[PDB]
Subunit: 218 residues, 2 copies
Amino acid sequence: SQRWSLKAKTVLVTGGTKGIGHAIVEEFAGFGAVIHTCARNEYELNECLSKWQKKGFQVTGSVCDASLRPEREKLMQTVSSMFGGKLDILINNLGALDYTAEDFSFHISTNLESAYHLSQLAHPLLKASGCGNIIFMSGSIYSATKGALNQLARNLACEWASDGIRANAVAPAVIAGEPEEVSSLVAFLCMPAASYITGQTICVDGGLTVNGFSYQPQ
Amino acid sequence: SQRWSLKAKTVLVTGGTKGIGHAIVEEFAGFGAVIHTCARNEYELNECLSKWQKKGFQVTGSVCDASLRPEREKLMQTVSSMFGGKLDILINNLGALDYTAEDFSFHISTNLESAYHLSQLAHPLLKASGCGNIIFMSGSIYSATKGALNQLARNLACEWASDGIRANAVAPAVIAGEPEEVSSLVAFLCMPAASYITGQTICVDGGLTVNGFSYQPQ
């Protein structure tokens, strides 16, 4: 039906050349969505774009270091011009001899800033779509980042609902199957069929029970 | 009893001249604990130290901008020398025309870095105590910070338990009584009576129920 279709929906997925981001691009491409992605290494971008267009996938890309403010502004500029000022889906895929406090601080703030800024740059585009979706896809360092990201996600969901923008966060399992499998949940959340789903922070962990009591990632 | 006593326990509380930090200093001082606190404004520090010593409170202080690495190293140096290399309690009290992404990022990383670093600087001191305690006391900006801090708290609780160090996070209510009242929960958590309590992230919110269904701060 039309509710379970992502056909011709415009998507921006950061870091689409590898890992979950690459799996997310393919998942959406399988549904006939129009995707734009980015990466720092232009040759690997070229490599993926090549292997994709042959599979009949509608994907374009640009070189970008999403950790840099000016790079994020240019990226969204490229996206607005190619999608005609409208963007249906934004997949904020965060980047993945012992880390110090400065390292801890830097990685957490770089991740949180890129995701926050990217969402703000896309806001007007997402608003013009009339049915925009944002997905935040992202130990110790990761846990704290995830904790911050979930909150931002829940805030934007309430803050931008009147603009018709939904926001959800998704995390791969801690205890496992390929973690890339989560791409299908990401896709479902962006379907009209899931228009009432917002503010969710889902971790598809295997989970565990002790003495009959369940335990899951916090 | 001895389990519910904080008498002569050494405490470092950051930002003790105002708000909850000031309430925490007084709460512990009421229990006969020995406290060291800090602040950027030396005159207000002097003001509090004066009003405190008269009440018979055992509190010393030093000027410090906990947002600066070298300032945090000096602070812990002062604490180690005055408490004899041992520290029982560390109260990481975070600092409290619209914020941008850089502002968002800066405040969250400055808070998370100060708290993380301060805990690492105190670690050896807390370890030498044999029964150390750490408390992390701390919209949109706050929510994300809190989300990150809670995770760090839960991590240190598991990571440092073998050193005899417990770690818990406490947050004042969102929906209310003075928010400063939470100082008593902070004090309880640091008592030998609460030695088995670690890894907790407690928000003493008023809470609310809708149509019979409860809702609380995430």
